[PDB]
Amino acid sequence: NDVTRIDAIESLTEYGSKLKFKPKAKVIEVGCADGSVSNILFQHLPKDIELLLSCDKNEKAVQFAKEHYKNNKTAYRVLDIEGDLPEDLKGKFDNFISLMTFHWVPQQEKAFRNVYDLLAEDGECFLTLKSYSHIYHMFVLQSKSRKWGPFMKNMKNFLSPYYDLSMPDQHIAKILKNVGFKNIDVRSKQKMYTFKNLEKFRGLMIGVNPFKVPENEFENYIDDLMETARTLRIIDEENGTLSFLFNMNIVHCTK
């Protein structure tokens, strides 16, 4: 939540001047999770806007957002952007935003067709997503191991679709062009983030981890996962810091 939080802010600084909102714009954010990043996003949108609808596949995250982060301008909804859109949303939106979400979506063409179908004419789309990452690579090392590999077979659906692609900016631009977008700008960025608390970090690994292993093996599984960061030598053992690289892709496009 702190990696994506700073990336959210980083991305909206860099692209603030480039992102245009018509007067009284309907904005839809996808992947609002708990809504603490939805709120930061909201403080960066123009006052003029009519609606920020924030969406997540996670019904429990959407409920927490309603309880805590609601105001007269925002509403929340359970929505799978890989699934079929509800009729009343089709064509209603001036601006579509998705920060650090689309790397969780395996069906990229389907999802981008649904972004398109959501937008009114001259809609702008603004996305950020991971390709390569040192975090993912930690999981890839784990999956090689004789012990943990049998429980890590859904690995490709967890990794960014762009983890091992050459020129993912151009693969994305192609999908977008093909779906029917215009003014397609895809830009790749190399990011570095430094963790200062190794206890907090192990917690985030347990948090990001999607593989089910036997309960009795779970502490060992996580121990070996923490060893993969020592293997890549991205832990600094004296000063208790972990600094990890990840590639970001920023998408800006219009209907």
Ligand X SMILES: Nc1ncnc2c1ncn2[C@@H]1O[C@H](CSCC[C@H](N)C(=O)O)[C@@H](O)[C@H]1O
Q: Which of residues 62-101 bind ligand X (CB under 6 A)?
A: 79-82, 99-101
Q: Which of residues 160-179 bind a second copy (CB under 8 A)?
A: 162, 164-170
Is position 37 an interface residue for ligand X (rule: CB under 6 A)? yes
Burial-class residue 226 by CB neighbours within 10 Å (0-12, 13-18, 19+): middle
Is position 247 an interface residue for a second copy (rule: CB under 8 A)? yes
CB-nearer residue toward a second copy: 223 or 236: 236
Cβ at position 193, least distance to a second copy in Å: 8
Own/partner contacts of 89-92, CB < 8 Å, gap of 24 or more, are 89/28, 89/118, 90/117, 90/118, 91/117, 91/118, 91/119, 91/120, 92/26, 92/28, 92/118, 92/120
The β-bridge partners of 248 are 130, 189
CB-nearer residue toward ligand X: 148 or 160: 160
> Looking at 69-77, 87-95, 183-191, 211-219, which segment touches a second copy (CB under 8 A)?
183-191
CB-nearer residue toward a second copy: 13 or 107: 13
Is position 17 an interface residue for a second copy (rule: CB under 8 A)? no
Is position 34 an interface residue for a second copy (rule: CB under 8 A)? no
Q: Which of residues 117-136 bind a second copy (CB under 8 A)?
A: 131-132
Cβ at position 236, least distance to ligand X in Å: 26
Report helix, strand or coil for 106: coil
Question: What would the two tokens of residue 3 be?
Answer: 């990696």
CA 87 vs. chain centroid, Å, equals: 25
Q: What's the one-letter identity of residue 90?
A: K
- Give the relative orientation of helices 198-208 and 218-231 as an angle to the nearest 10 degrees: 120
- Residue 52 interface partner, choices ligand X, a second copy, none, CB cut-off 5-8 Å depending on type: none
